[PDB]
JSON list of C-alpha atoms in Angstrom, two decimals:
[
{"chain": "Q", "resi": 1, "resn": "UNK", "atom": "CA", "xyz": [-11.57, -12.91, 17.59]},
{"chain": "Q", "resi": 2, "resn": "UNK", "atom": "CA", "xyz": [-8.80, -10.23, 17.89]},
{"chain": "Q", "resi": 3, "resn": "UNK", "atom": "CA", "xyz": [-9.61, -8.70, 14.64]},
{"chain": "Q", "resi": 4, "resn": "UNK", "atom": "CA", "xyz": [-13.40, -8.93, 13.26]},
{"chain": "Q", "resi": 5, "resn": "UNK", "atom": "CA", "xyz": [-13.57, -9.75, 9.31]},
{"chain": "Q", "resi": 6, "resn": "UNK", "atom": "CA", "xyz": [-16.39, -10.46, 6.89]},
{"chain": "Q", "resi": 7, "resn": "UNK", "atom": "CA", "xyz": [-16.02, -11.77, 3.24]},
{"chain": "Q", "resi": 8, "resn": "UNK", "atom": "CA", "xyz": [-17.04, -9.73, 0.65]},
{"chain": "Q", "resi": 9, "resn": "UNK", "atom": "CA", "xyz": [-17.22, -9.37, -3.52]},
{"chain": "Q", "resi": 10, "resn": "UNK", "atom": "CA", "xyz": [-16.50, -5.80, -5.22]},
{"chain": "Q", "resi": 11, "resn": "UNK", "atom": "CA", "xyz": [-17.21, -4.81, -8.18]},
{"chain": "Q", "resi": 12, "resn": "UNK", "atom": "CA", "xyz": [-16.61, -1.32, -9.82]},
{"chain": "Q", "resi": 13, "resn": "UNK", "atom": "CA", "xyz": [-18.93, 0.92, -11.04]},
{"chain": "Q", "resi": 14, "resn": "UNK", "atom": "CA", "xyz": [-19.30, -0.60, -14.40]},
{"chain": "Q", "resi": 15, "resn": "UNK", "atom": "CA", "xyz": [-20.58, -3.45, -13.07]},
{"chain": "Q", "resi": 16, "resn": "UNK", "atom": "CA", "xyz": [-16.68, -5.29, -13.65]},
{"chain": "Q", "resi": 17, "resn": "UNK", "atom": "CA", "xyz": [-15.92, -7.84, -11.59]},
{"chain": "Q", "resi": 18, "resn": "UNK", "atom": "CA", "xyz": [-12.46, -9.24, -10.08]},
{"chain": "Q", "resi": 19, "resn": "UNK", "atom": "CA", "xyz": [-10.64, -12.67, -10.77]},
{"chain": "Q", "resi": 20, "resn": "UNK", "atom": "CA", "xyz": [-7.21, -13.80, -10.35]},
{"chain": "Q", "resi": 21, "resn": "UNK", "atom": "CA", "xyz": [-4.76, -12.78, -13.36]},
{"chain": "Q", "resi": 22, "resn": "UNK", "atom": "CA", "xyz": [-1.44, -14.39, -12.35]},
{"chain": "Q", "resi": 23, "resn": "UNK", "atom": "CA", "xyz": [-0.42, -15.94, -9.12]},
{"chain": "Q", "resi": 24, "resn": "UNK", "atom": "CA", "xyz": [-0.01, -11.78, -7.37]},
{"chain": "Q", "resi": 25, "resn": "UNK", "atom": "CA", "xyz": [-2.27, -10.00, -9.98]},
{"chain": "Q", "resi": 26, "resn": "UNK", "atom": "CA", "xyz": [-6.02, -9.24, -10.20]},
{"chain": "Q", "resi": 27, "resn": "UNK", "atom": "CA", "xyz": [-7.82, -8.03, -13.69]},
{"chain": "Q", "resi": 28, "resn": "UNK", "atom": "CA", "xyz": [-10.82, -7.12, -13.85]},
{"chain": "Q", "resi": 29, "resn": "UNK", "atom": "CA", "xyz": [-13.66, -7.67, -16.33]},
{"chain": "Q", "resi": 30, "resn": "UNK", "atom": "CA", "xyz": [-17.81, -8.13, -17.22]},
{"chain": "Q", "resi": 31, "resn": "UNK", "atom": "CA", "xyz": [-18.65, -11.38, -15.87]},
{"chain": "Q", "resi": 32, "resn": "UNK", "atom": "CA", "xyz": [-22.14, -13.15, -16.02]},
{"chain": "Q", "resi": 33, "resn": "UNK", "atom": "CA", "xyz": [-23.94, -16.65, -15.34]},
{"chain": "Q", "resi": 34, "resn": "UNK", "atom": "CA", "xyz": [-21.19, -19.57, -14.58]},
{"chain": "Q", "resi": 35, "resn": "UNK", "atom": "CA", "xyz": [-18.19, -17.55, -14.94]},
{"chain": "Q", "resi": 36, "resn": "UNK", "atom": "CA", "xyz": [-19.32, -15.74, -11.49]},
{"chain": "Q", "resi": 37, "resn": "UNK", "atom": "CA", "xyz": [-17.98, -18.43, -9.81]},
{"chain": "Q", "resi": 38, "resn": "UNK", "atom": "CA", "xyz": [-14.34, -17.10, -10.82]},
{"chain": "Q", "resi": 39, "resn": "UNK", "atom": "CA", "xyz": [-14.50, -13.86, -9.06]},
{"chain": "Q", "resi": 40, "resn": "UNK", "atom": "CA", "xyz": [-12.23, -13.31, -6.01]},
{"chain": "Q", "resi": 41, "resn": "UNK", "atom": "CA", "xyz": [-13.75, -13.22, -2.62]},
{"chain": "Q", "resi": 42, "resn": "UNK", "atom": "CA", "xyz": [-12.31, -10.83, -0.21]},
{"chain": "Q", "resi": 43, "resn": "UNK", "atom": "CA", "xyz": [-11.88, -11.09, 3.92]},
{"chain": "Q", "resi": 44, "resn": "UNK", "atom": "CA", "xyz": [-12.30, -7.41, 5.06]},
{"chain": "Q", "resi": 45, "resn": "UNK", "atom": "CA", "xyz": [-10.24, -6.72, 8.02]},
{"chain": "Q", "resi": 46, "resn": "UNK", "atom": "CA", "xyz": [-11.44, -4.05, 9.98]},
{"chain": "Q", "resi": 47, "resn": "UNK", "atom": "CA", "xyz": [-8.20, -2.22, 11.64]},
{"chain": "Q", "resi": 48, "resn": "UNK", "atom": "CA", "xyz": [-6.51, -0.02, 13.64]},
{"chain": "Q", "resi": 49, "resn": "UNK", "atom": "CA", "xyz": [-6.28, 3.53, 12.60]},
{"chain": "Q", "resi": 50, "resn": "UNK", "atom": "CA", "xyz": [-7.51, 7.23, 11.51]},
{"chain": "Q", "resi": 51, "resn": "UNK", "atom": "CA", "xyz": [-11.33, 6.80, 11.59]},
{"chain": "Q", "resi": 52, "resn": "UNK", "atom": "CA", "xyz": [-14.25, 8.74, 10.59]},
{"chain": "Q", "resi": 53, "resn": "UNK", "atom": "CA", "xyz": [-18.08, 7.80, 10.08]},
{"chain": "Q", "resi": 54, "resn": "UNK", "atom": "CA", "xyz": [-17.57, 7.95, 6.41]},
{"chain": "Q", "resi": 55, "resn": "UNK", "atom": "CA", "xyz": [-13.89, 7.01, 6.30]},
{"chain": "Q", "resi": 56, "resn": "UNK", "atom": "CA", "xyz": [-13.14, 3.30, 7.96]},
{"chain": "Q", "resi": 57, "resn": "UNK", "atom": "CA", "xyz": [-9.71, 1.71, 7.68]},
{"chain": "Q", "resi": 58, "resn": "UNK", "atom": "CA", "xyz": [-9.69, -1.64, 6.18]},
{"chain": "Q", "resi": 59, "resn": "UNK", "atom": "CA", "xyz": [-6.91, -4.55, 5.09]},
{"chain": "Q", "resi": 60, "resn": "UNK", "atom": "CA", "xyz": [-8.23, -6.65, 2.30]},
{"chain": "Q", "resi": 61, "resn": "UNK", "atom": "CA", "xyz": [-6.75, -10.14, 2.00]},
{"chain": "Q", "resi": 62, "resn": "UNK", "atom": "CA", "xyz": [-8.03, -13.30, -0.09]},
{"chain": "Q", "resi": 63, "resn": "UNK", "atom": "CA", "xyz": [-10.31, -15.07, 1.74]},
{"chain": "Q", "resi": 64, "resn": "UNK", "atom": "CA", "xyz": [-8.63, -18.33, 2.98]},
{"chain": "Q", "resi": 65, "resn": "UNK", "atom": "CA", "xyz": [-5.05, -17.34, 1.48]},
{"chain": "Q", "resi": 66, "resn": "UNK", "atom": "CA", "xyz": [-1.86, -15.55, 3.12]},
{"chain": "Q", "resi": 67, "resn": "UNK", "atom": "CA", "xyz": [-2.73, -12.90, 0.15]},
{"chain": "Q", "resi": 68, "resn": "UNK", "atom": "CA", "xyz": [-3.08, -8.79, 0.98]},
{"chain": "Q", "resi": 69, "resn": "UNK", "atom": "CA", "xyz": [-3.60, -6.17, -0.93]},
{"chain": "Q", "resi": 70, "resn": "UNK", "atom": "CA", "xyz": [-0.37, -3.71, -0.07]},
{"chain": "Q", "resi": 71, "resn": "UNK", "atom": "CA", "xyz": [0.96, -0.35, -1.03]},
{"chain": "Q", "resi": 72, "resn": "UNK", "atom": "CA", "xyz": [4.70, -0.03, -1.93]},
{"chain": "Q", "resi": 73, "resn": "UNK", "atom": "CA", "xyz": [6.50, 2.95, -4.00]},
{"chain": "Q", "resi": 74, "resn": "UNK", "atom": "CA", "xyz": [7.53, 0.65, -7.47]},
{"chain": "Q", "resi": 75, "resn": "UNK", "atom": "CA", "xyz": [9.74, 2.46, -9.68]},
{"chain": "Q", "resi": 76, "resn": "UNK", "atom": "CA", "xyz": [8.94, 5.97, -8.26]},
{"chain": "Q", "resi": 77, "resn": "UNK", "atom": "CA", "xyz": [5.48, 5.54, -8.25]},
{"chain": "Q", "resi": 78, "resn": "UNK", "atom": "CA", "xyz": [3.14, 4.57, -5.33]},
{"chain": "Q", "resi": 79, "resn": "UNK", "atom": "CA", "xyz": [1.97, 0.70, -6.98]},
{"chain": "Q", "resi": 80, "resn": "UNK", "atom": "CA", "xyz": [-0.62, -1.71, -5.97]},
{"chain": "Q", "resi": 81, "resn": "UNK", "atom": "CA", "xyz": [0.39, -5.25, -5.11]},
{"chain": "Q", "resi": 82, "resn": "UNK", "atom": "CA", "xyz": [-0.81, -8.84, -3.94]},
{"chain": "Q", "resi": 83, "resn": "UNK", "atom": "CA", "xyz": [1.63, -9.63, -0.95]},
{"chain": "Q", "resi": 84, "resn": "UNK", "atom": "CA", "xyz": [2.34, -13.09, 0.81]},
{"chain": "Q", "resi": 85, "resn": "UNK", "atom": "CA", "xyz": [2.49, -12.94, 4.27]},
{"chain": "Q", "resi": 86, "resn": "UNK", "atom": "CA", "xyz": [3.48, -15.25, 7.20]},
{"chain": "Q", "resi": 87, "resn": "UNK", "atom": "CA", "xyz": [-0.09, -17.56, 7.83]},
{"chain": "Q", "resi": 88, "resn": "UNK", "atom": "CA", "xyz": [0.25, -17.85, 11.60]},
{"chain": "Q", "resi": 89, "resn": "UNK", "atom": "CA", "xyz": [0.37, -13.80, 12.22]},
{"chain": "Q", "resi": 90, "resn": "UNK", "atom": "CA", "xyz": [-2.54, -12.41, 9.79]},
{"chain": "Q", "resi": 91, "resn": "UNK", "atom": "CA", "xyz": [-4.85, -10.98, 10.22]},
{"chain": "Q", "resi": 92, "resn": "UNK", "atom": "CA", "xyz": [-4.29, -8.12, 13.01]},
{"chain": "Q", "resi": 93, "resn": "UNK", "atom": "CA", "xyz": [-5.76, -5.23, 14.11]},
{"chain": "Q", "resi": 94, "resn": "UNK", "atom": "CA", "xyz": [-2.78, -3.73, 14.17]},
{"chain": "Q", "resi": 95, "resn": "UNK", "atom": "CA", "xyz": [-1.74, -4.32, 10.04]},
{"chain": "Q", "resi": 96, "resn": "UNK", "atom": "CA", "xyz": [1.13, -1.88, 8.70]},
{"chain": "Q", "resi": 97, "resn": "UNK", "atom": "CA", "xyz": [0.79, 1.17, 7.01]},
{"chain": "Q", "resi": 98, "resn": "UNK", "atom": "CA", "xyz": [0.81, -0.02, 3.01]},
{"chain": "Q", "resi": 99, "resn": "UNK", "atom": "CA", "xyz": [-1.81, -2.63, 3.52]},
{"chain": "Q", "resi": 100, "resn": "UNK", "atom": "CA", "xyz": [-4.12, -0.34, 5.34]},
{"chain": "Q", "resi": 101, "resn": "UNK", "atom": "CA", "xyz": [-7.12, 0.93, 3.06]},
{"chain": "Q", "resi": 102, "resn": "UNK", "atom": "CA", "xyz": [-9.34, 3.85, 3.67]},
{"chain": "Q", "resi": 103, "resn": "UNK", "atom": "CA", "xyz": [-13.02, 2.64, 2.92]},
{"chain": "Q", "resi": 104, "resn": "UNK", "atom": "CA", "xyz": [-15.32, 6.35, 2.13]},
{"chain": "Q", "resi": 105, "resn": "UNK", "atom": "CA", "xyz": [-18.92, 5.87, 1.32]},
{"chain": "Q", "resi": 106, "resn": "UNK", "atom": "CA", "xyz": [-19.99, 8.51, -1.29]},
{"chain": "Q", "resi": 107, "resn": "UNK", "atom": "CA", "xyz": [-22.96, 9.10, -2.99]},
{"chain": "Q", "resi": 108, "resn": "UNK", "atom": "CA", "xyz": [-23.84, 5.48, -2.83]},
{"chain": "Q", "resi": 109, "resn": "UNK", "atom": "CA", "xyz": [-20.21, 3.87, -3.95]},
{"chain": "Q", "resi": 110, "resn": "UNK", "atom": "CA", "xyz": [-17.73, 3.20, -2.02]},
{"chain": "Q", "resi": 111, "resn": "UNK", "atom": "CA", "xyz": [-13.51, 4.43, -2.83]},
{"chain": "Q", "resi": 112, "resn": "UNK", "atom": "CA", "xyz": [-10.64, 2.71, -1.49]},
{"chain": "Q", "resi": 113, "resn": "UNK", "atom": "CA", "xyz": [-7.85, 5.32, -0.49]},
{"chain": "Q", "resi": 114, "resn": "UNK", "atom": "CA", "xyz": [-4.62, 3.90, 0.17]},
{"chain": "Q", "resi": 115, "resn": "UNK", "atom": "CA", "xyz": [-3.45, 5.11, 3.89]},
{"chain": "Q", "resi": 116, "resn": "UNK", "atom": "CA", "xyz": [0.03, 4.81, 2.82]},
{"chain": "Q", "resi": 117, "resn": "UNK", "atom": "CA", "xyz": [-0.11, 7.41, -0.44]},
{"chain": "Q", "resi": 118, "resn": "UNK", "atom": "CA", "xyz": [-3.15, 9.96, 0.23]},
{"chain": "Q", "resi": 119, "resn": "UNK", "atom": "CA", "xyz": [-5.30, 10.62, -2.87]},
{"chain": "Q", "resi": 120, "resn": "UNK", "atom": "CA", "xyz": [-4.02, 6.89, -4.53]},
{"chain": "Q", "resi": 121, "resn": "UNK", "atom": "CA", "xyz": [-7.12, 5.26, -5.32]},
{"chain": "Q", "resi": 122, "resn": "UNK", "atom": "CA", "xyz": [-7.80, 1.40, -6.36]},
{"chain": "Q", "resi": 123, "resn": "UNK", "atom": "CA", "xyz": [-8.65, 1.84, -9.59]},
{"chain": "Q", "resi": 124, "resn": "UNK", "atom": "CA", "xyz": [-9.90, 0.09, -12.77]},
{"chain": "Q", "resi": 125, "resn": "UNK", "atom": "CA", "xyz": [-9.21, 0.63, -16.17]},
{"chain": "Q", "resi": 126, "resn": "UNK", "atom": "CA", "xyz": [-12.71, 1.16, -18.60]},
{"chain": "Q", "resi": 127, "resn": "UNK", "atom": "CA", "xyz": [-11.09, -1.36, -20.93]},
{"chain": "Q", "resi": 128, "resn": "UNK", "atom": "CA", "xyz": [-11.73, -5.14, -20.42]},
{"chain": "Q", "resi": 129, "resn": "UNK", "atom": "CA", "xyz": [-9.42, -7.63, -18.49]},
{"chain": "Q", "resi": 130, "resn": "UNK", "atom": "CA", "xyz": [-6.75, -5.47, -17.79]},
{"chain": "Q", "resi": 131, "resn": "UNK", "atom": "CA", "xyz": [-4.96, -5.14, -14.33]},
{"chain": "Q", "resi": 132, "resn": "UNK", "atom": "CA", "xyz": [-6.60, -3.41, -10.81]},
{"chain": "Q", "resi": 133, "resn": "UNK", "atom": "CA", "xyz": [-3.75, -1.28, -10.09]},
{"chain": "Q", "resi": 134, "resn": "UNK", "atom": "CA", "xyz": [-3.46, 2.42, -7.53]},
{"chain": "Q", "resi": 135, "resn": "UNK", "atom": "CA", "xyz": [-4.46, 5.48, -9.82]},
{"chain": "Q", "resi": 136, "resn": "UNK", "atom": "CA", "xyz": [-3.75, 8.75, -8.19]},
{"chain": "Q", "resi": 137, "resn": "UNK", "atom": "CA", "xyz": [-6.84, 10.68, -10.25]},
{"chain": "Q", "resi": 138, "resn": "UNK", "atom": "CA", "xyz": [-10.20, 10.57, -9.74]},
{"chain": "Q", "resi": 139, "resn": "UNK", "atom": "CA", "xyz": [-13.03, 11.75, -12.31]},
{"chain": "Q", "resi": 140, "resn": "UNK", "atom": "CA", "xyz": [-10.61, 11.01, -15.09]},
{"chain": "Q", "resi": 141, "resn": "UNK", "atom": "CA", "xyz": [-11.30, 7.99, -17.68]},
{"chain": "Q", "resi": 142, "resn": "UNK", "atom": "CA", "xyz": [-10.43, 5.41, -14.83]},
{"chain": "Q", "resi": 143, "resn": "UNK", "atom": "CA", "xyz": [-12.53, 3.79, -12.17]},
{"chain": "Q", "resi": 144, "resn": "UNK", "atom": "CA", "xyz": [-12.37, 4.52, -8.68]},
{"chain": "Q", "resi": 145, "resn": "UNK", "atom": "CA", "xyz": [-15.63, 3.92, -7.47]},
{"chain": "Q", "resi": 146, "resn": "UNK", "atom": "CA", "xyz": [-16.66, 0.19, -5.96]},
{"chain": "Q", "resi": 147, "resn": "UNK", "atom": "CA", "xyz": [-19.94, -1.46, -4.51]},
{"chain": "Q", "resi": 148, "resn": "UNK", "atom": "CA", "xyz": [-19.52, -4.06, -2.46]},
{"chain": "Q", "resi": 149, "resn": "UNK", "atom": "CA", "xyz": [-21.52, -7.04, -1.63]},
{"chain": "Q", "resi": 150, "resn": "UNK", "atom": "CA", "xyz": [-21.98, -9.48, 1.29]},
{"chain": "Q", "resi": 151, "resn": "UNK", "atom": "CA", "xyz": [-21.02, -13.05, 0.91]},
{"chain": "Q", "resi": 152, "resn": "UNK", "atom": "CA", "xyz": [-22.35, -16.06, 3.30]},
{"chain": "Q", "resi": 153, "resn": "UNK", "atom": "CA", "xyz": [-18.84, -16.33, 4.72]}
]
């Protein structure tokens, strides 16, 4: 396989999990029992660029949907976005700039940088169900820290 990819659930350091809002939006919120089920599952793409033994650049698609995670300036501001992309040429190592993601392990959490905008983070609101979007502060009332777990692909 060109490019080497394992699925993968995240969840932020309150525990939220992530679920589909609309058809390109994900919200998270605290999920439990049944409801699990509903939580996206990610294919981590490990690609080309900039690496470091606590920094590895990732792409993070839907597993099993022409879905990425990208990067694009929106009204001035660098925005987070779910972007379709042709089926028969994704995943590869070599992914452009705004859906590459920095991966740092911290303490014992993991950050998601975006490659594209230095210091824009994938964030999470403390409030319940609303949007994931890119936050460009960290240790501010917003989330920036993740776990992630391993799923039997």
């Amino acid at each position: 396989a060109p490019v080497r990819s394992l699925n993968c659930t995240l969840r932020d350091s309150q525990q939220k999990s992530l679920v589909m809002s609309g058809p390109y939006e994900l919200k998270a919120l605290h999920l439990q029992g049944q409801d699990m089920e509903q939580q996206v599952v990610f294919s981590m793409s490990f690609v080309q660029g900039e690496e470091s033994n606590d920094k590895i650049p990732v792409a993070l698609g839907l597993k099993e949907k022409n879905l990425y995670l990208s990067c694009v300036l929106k009204d001035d501001k660098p925005t987070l976005q779910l972007e379709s992309v042709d089926p028969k040429n994704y995943p590869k190592k070599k992914m452009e700039k705004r859906f590459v993601f920095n991966k740092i392990e911290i303490n014992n959490k993991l950050e998601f940088e975006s490659a594209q905008f230095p210091n824009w983070y994938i964030s999470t609101s403390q409030a319940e169900n609303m949007p994931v979007f890119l936050g460009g502060t960290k240790g501010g009332q917003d989330i920036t820290d993740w776990t992630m777990q391993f799923v039997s692909s």
